[PDB]
């Protein structure tokens, strides 16, 4: 199966605070596995999955040190961006970064990622070629020219194609315990006297991606939502004429399933 | 292992 790693980094400044607050969260196959937060009493990368305790103190000291550097980087960048956008003193501002790699089922690098957002909006991103930059805003051209001039792309490309892949392999080897499993959904339908409303529930599944469809032909649904125990929930409903209860069937599609479920009101 | 960044914006 395919696999992925990401690091999602955020720096926030507020009118009150003197210095911004820096947070970094690492993910493997979309499950959180490490975390740094500068508001913490003793700022450090802490493990977040059980299988990560296997790393000795040199790992944690090293990564922590990188984090302290990123905090420096985000602080300065925030400062420069303020100037670029002619923003004045006395506002909240935020800067966000996503970086990482995608692997195919053969464990080869499918694609690398490296994008930034300012005030929640795309600021600059590294194209799929890991050589050129895309940046919409006129203000963002200043950073584009700077980074093109200095060879920034090559050093991100090296990380994304090397370290990112290399260490993700290692984490997966260590995670041939907790991460192998995907949880199939368990489906059931409920009745409500709206005409009546039929509601197809899907419960206890991982990962979140899932599809629900009523039939017949191709409705009200809610956004997929975490149960809070590592699994997810979703439902889809339709309004139906009273008595015509069995013309309608629900279908559930999920990667854990050997095949799609088919169910109706029992 | 986390990336570290080069030129500041």
């Amino acid at each position: 199966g395919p696999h992925s790693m990401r690091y999602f980094e955020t720096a926030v400044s507020r009118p009150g605070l003197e210095e911004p607050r820096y947070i970094s969260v690492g993910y493997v196959d979309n499950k959180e596995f490490v975390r740094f937060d500068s508001d913490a009493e003793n700022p450090r990368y802490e493990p977040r999955a059980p299988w990560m305790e296997q790393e000795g103190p040199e790992y944690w000291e090293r990564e922590t040190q990188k984090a302290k550097g990123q905090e420096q980087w985000f602080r300065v960048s925030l400062r420069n961006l303020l100037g670029y956008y002619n923003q004045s003193a006395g506002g909240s501002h935020t800067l966000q970064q996503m970086s990482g790699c995608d692997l195919g089922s053969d464990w080869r690098l499918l694609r690398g990622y490296l994008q930034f957002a300012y005030e929640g909006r795309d600021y600059i991103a590294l194209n799929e070629d890991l050589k050129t930059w895309t940046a919409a805003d006129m203000a963002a051209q200043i950073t584009r020219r700077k980074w093109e001039q200095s060879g920034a792309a090559e050093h991100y490309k090296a990380y994304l194609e090397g370290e990112c892949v290399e260490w993700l392999h290692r984490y997966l080897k260590n995670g041939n315990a907790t991460l192998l499993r995907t949880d199939s959904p368990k489906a059931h339908v409920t009745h409500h006297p709206r005409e009546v409303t039929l509601r197809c529930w899907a419960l206890g599944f991982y990962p979140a991606d899932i599809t629900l469809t009523w039939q017949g032909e191709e409705m009200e649904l809610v956004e997929t939502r975490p149960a809070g125990d590592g699994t997810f929930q979703k439902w889809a409903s339709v309004v139906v004429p009273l008595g015509k209860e069995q013309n309608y069937t629900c279908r559930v599609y999920h990667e854990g399933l050997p095949e799609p479920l088919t169910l109706r009101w029992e | 292992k986390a990336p570290f960044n080069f030129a500041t914006m």
């Binding site: 909240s92 935020t94 409500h192 | -």
Partner: protein, 99 residues
Amino acid sequence: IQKTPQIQVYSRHPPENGKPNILNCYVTQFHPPHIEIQMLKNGKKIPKVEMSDMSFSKDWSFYILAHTEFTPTETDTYACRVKHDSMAEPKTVYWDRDM
């Protein structure tokens, strides 16, 4: 500019009156990350409430899951009130055990 948050309130386990369960308040899709979240029992703040650490989605919007031990009854009603700079007043969404 600001993204207005989406809110669902729902029980981890299928609800049954008189059974301990967990009530979640999933607040998604908001910017900036500063937000305030209250879970209410019959209109009052619930004493102590679990608050996941803030995180963000691939589209650069932040999200958070709040939760609290509760025991549903016939008559009590539970709500979640969110406060954010996208909204001039707070937003409340009530729990529906069928949803």
